[PDB]
DNA sequence: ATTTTGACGCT
DNA sequence: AGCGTCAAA
């Protein structure tokens, strides 16, 4: 009752660029705008592997992970943009730089946590308090929320999408108590106003469109973000949680899309997030561990406390290349040449990072996969990273992995290598 | 033969 | 330290 926390203490947004790599290429090449198009890596094997897909192409059934040749079977007029190749490998520099454009715009509004190349969490609690102070009890106009959906509305006693959006928004604003500066629903509504402003700023200053979720924590903000894409934002209030979760597959909640979610479904014999409410905290801890159990018990009630971390920059800088099937590296020379290619890209990115961000990586992580291993990585070794020098880094990586070569022949490498990975970690201020 | 990434938990 | 999990374009 009066002491039961409700996880309504924060306003958190998650902003996620729509079909990000596609928008980067469409900004660059106007011929691709408003077309079924996709971004692809490589080209020789089955036309290349698709990594990003415009919504026009998605209407034909084109998806990520599809080979371009097969996507062309579904969408004959599909246009393609190729990822840059440098030093024999795909190079994602263009997308990292576009990401920096968006992250720097978002950081003007609030502290952000970079969650991936194209998405960031925003802690809007403080910004909401100031905006509420400026508003001075003034009602919030639907005009301030031109692209916002209120999850769960309209409800109760138009057949077009925008009509429904406005109906729900009208119901929500009609119900709001604007005189209580401490109302969680009001705080979320002001948050959504700020996110409308953030998203307009991103589109104005970059050309890129995005979607966003606004809620009281990161998990609900992420889930909300996905409910109305593209180019829209969704507010998930605390009160919307019971109905939303009553038919929400467990796997749709962030961190439950893999084995743990599968085990929750299998062990408990449930399908939807809301069904978790029927278990005690101790029961959930008994099956999934103390930490997971406490997290699940609160999350199924819409409560999560993971903070928006103040971190705009990635914590590691890595380069990697797979060598599938017959291309697996089977000679020492091959392994050293590709280690050099990776190390040269890594050096270029590390030097840029050091100049821009006043930091230096101090550890080099070397990871390989050997042909015949189910795991993504077969082996991981670290060494000191003391100089931004590609030849030294590639030599050091070879030194830490050379004993993995079973082969009795000095010139040959066995078992052949199907993956190489170099990652600079453990940054210190400089 | 999705590939190339990036964060964080466990022991 | 090294491995595993979950997630992104
Ligand atoms: Ca996205
Ligand atoms: Mg996606
Ligand atoms: Mg994303």
Q: Looking at the 3D structure of chain A, how many domains does it have? A: 4
The CA A120 to ligand 3 mean position distance, Å, reads: 8
Structure tokens at A193: 């106003």
A316 CB contact with strand B at below 7 Å: yes
Torsion-angle region of residue A108: left (phi > 0), alpha (psi -120 to 50) or beta?
alpha
Question: Which stretch of DSSP H or E encloses residue A395?
Answer: helix A390-401
Nucleotide nearest to A255 (CA to C1'): C6
The annotation places the binding site of A for Mg(2+) at: 16-17, 118-119
Q: Quick one: A345 and A227 in the same domain?
A: no
Q: Quick one: A222 and A133 in the same domain?
A: yes
What is the radius of gyration, based on Cα positions, of chain A?
A: 25
Nominal resolution in Å? Answer: 2.1
CA separation for the pair A114, A312 (Å, rounded): 5
| Separation of A177 CA and B4 C1' (Å) | 48
Q: Quick one: A81 and A93 in the same domain?
A: no
The CA A192 to ligand 3 mean position distance, Å, reads: 19
DSSP for residue A45: T
Q: Quick one: A297 and A363 in the same domain?
A: no
Q: Quick one: A24 and A74 in the same domain?
A: yes
Q: Are A384 and A363 in contact (CB under 8 A)?
A: yes
Q: Per-residue b/e over A336-351, b at no fewer than 16 CB within 10 Å?
A: bebbbbbbbbbbbbbe
Q: Quick one: A32 and A177 in the same domain?
A: no
What residues sit around ligand 3, an ion, with C-beta below 5 angstroms? A 16, 118-119
- The per-residue DSSP string of A147-202 comes to TEEETT-S-----SHHHHHHHHHHHHHHH--TT-TT-HHHHHHHHHHHHHHHHHHH
Q: Quick one: A145 and A37 in the same domain?
A: no
Q: Quick one: A5 and A147 in the same domain?
A: yes
Q: Quick one: A6 and A110 in the same domain?
A: yes
> Across the strands, what pairs with A41?
A49
CA separation for the pair A145, A209 (Å, rounded): 16
Question: Which stretch of DSSP H or E encloses residue A296?
Answer: helix A290-299
Nearest to A261 by CA among A226, A224, A299: A299
User: Which of the listed residues A284, A307, A330 is the one where a domain comes to its end?
Assistant: A307
Contact positions of strand B to protein Cβ (< 7 A): 1-10
Q: Quick one: A321 and A405 in the same domain?
A: yes
The CA A231 to ligand 1 mean position distance, Å, reads: 11
**Structure method:** X-ray
A317 CB contact with strand B at below 7 Å: yes
Which residue range is the domain that position A139 belongs to?
1-18+89-249
CA separation for the pair A166, A144 (Å, rounded): 12
Question: Which stretch of DSSP H or E encloses residue A107?
Answer: helix A93-107
Contact positions of strand C to protein Cβ (< 7 A): 1-9
| Separation of A321 CA and C2 C1' (Å) | 21
> Across the strands, what pairs with A50?
A40
Nucleotide nearest to A20 (CA to C1'): C9
Q: Are A53 and A62 in contact (CB under 8 A)?
A: yes
Structure tokens at A411: 């010139």
DSSP for residue A209: -
Ligand lying closest to the C-alpha of residue A116: 3
| Alpha-helical segments (H) within A184-280 | 184-206, 218-227, 241-246, 259-268
Say which residues have a Cβ less than 8 Å from residue A127's Cβ, sequence separation at least 6. A109, A110, A191, A194
User: Which of the listed residues A307, A330, A350 is the one where a domain comes to its end?
Assistant: A307
Q: Quick one: A101 and A230 in the same domain?
A: yes
Q: Quick one: A1 and A132 in the same domain?
A: yes
């Amino acid at each position: 009752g009066p002491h039961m926390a409700t996880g309504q203490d924060r306003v958190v947004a998650l902003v996620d660029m729509d079909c990000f790599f596609v928008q980067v290429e469409q900004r660059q090449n106007p011929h691709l705008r408003n077309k079924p198009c996709a971004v692809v890596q490589y080209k020789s094997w089955k036309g290349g592997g698709i990594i990003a897909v415009s919504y026009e192409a998605r209407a034909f059934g084109v998806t990520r992970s599809m080979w371009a040749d097969d996507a062309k079977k579904l969408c004959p007029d599909l246009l393609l943009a190729q990822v840059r190749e440098s030093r024999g490998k795909a190079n994602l520099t263009k997308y990292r730089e576009a990401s920096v454009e968006v992250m720097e715009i978002m950081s003007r509004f609030a502290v952000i946590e970079r969650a991936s190349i194209d998405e960031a969490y925003v802690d809007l609690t403080s910004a909401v308090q100031e905006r509420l102070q400026k508003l001075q009890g003034q009602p919030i106009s639907a005009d301030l929320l031109p692209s916002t959906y209120i999850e769960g509305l309209p409800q109760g006693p138009t057949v077009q999408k925008e009509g429904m959006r406005k109906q729900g928004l009208f119901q929500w604003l009609d119900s709001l108590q604007i005189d209580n500066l401490t109302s969680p629903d009001l705080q979320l509504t002001v948050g959504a106003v700020i996110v409308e402003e953030m998203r307009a700023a991103i589109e104005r200053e970059t050309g890129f469109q995005c979607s966003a979720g606004i809620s009281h924590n990161k998990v609900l903000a992420k889930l909300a973000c996905g409910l109305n894409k593209p180019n829209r934002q969704t507010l998930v209030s605390h009160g919307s949680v019971p109905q939303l979760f009553s038919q929400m597959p467990i796997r749709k909640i962030r961190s439950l899309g893999g084995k743990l979610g599968a085990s929750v479904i299998e062990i408990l014999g449930i399908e939807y997030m809301g069904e978790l409410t029927q278990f005690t905290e101790s029961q959930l801890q008994s099956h999934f561990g103390e930490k997971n159990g406490s997290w699940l018990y609160a999350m199924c009630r819409g409560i999560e406390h993971d903070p928006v971390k103040p971190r705009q920059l990635p914590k590691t800088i890595g380069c990697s290349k797979n060598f599938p099937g017959k291309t697996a590296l089977a000679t020492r020379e091959q392994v050293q040449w590709w280690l050099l290619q990776l190390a040269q890209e890594l050096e270029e990115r590390l030097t840029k990072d050091r100049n821009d961000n006043d930091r230096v990586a101090t550890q080099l992580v070397v990871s390989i996969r050997v042909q015949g291993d189910k795991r993504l990585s077969s082996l991981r070794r670290c060494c000191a990273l003391t100089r931004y020098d590609a030849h030294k880094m590639s030599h050091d990586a070879f030194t830490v992995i050379k004993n993995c070569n079973t082969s009795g022949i000095q010139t040959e490498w066995s078992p052949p290598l199907t993956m190489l990975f170099l990652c600079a970690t453990k940054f210190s201020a400089s």
